[PDB]
Amino acid sequence: XXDXXFXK
Amino acid sequence: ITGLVYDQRMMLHHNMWDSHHPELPQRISRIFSRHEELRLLSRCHRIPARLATEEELALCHSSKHISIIKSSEHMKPRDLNRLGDEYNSIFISNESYTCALLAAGSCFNSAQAILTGQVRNAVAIVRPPGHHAEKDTACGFCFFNTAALTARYAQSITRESLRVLIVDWDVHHGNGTQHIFEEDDSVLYISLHRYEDGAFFPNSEDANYDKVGLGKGRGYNVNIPWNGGKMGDPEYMAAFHHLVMPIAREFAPELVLVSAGFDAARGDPLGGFQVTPEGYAHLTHQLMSLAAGRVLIILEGGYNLTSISESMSMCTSMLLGDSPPSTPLKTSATVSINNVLRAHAPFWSSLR
Ligand SMILES: [K+]
Ligand SMILES: [K+]
Ligand SMILES: [Zn+2]
């Protein structure tokens, strides 16, 4: 989801 | 005596839009429960949690950053979403600021308990995590840099230049900790982290092995980056053998803080690595040979509830004095270790 740490 | 701090109130920080976000309230309650089940809790001295003060947050953070996070306590959901989205990988609820204060204050009380001689070592089961938080901004699930603040707090009750070692074995680079201490020779920062030449969060070349510190801090920043391999116990044991422990012995810290994320653990949905609970026990046991045993283990990341509960419990077992429990390296891990040795041999005679 474009969240840097989750890669999602 | 081993100290332990845990407060259920740190569960109140939550993601109101995505209940399956991996930085779950039950991360800390699951770890705490496993300590109870393994009969480790009753062997520890319980240290009370407390709120950090804003003056204490200013040891590492700007007044603007403190006031912005503080203001989120009173925001409506639309404004919490907007504010959180201004940062890299942050969600905020009205309870977030309080929980971040409790995480930091709990670690201050633990460091105080060690440095006043009430306990020899301690474990802090806290959230939200801290090591990505910068002087001026929140980042990567972190609001305030708990471990960095604890080092400064320790210095504030003993000696301004007290030598503190921070070992950050969370699978992500602690960009905030590195930056806060990058020009400082009183705080040695050693990070092991997945790197993948910048493809892995926090996605910056600041995490590479050639970033060794600046000014009087040159040599006092040690990055051990992993590339091209599912690393595990052999690689972490080798990094401790060749790098972490020789450098730490030469530095001779008076206090060891572990930024103890457990997302390099077997089973972690983000890390992709396979360090075992026995592996973490051996890492802890090695660190206990430093600083006359003055070691404080601070929860950072780690997102498989079973993995973090078994892994952190193994660490506490080692702090309590239990016997440690019972392979060639990936070739790219050898490359990484040799790169760090070449980068740091100018500064540490133990590496020559
Ligand atoms: K790390
Ligand atoms: K440093
Ligand atoms: Zn992490």
Residue numbers in the entry:
A (entry chain I): 1 to 8
B (entry chain A): 443 to 768, 773 to 798
Tell me, in the authors' exact words, what the paper reports.
To address this challenge, we develop a computational “anchor extension” methodology for targeting protein interfaces by extending a peptide chain around a non-canonical amino acid residue anchor. To test our approach using a well characterized model system, we design cyclic peptides that inhibit histone deacetylases 2 and 6 (HDAC2 and HDAC6) with enhanced potency compared to the original anchor (IC50 values of 9.1 and 4.4 nM for the best binders compared to 5.4 and 0.6 µM for the anchor, respectively). SHA can coordinate to the zinc ion in the active site of HDACs.
However, we obtained a crystal structure of des4.3.1 with zebrafish (Danio rerio) HDAC6 at 1.7 Å resolution. This peptide inhibits human HDAC6 with an IC50 value of 17.1 nM, 88-fold more potently than HDAC2. In particular, d-Arg8 occupies the negative phi region of the Ramachandran map (φ = 166° in the design and -46° in the crystal structure). If the d-Arg is replaced by l-Arg during conformational sampling, the lowest energy structures are very close to the crystal structure. The newly adopted conformation is complementary in shape to the contour of the active site and stabilized by several backbone-backbone hydrogen bonds and n → π* interactions. The peptide also forms both direct and water-mediated hydrogen bonding interactions with residues in the outer active site cleft of HDAC6. Notably Ser531 of HDAC6 donates a hydrogen bond to the carboxylate group of Asp7 and accepts a hydrogen bond from the backbone amide of SHA; Ser531 similarly accepts a hydrogen bond from the backbone amide of bound acetyl-lysine HDAC substrates.
